[PDB]
Amino acid sequence: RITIKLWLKKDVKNVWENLVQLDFFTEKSAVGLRDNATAAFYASNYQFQGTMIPFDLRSYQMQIILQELRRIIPKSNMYYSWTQL
């Protein structure tokens, strides 16, 4: 529609790492914090399956929905046409 550096595959992972620990995403079925000690200790011994599928297929879900992004992102930014569908 017009000069923007499209990045590779091998680098977005480094950006994808901070996004999940900025809690903008969640894992699909992940009980976050156990209530007491012995319920957490029962979750530590349990070997998991989501790590056994690779990094690029852990089914990440959403914390902040699309429609709310339009209200916070200003219209001066170029991606404002992408907030709405």
């Binding site: 990045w7 901070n18 809690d23 914090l33 000690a37 200790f41 399956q49």
Partner: protein, 422 residues
Amino acid sequence: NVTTPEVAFREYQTNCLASYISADPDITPSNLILQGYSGTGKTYTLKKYFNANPNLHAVWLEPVELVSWKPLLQAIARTVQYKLKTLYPNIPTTDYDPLQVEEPFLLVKTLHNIFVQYESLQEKTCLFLILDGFDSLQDLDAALFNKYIKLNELLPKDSKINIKFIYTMLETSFLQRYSTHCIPTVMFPRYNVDEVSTILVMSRCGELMEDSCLRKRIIEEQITDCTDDQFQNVAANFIHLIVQAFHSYTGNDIFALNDLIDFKWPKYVSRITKENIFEPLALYKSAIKLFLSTDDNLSQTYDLSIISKYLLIASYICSYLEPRYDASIFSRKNPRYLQPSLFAIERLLAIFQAIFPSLMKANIEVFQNLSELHTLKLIATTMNKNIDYLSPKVRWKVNVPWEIIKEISESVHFNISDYFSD
């Protein structure tokens, strides 16, 4: 009244931490939250306060070098009697066993034993404990953080020495679980693109002008007597450009900038000239090649044998090929993105016998390469890794992405993209 320090971008936050901390215990609030993500220098700006305040006494603990709460109590009780030995050496002591404690009663049992012999002091002195990294404890839960809040009130309140806390944690979803306790919080904001570069220049000038990789390149080239300021400029021209060609890749980190500098620095040093010391813009034009690549990745043609190669190429087929379609399209007469489905045994050899170049019948080495592929973790069990041999209910699945399959298809001259049809 306290002697505040001064730092670069914590001008509001130095005031509040000078506000919420005094040497007097009565003015000192009990519990405190320093919150922010990694990449704000909270461990920096806290100790930077403490070096400017030699009047108070700080005991520094580190939860991240511990693993659990049961040593964490042993971490606390060992250190306070260690500290109070080095603060009041005239006071005699029945030294207790810090190995003895393992339960949250036993701490306040022992702190009832510790502080009573120290009752003869002259004024109410406070004593600040510091926990650094409370969210990344690797056995945390809901009912640990409140367990450490009320520890002050179980202590006798009239003792000459009062223990108070400061908690360092991150992941602010965690703090939203405990806002109803209303303990005073000092949040630490993230950074902006200028103040990342502004922090980074005043912290990395002390090494990158004094590195021998510069100092070699000084005497290796015809050294004009360039000043330290001339060394300061090229260092500053380096930092003001490296954050400009990489900020979108790294975000507002500081740690991820502190090492990418130390990877691209000597490769930048070799591409300087004697003349480009005065010529910075053309120097970037000569050293361009590193500024558009990441250089953090230290695509294999895989080691496995030929029959094991076709063993892999049949296992990728049941990422899309369901049993309703496969036996029709593979007669002897799109989920490329999606997560892979679940195998069973002998559906492999159902597809393996078909796609192999009657030419083969012995399957001893074919059974060899299966558990060879199981040790490579390229095809793994759905269940635990124990009973998968004897055919009970065991489902199998690949763990290799599409591209490594695509190269290994052509590596054995086999065509796979025909049989994937949306």
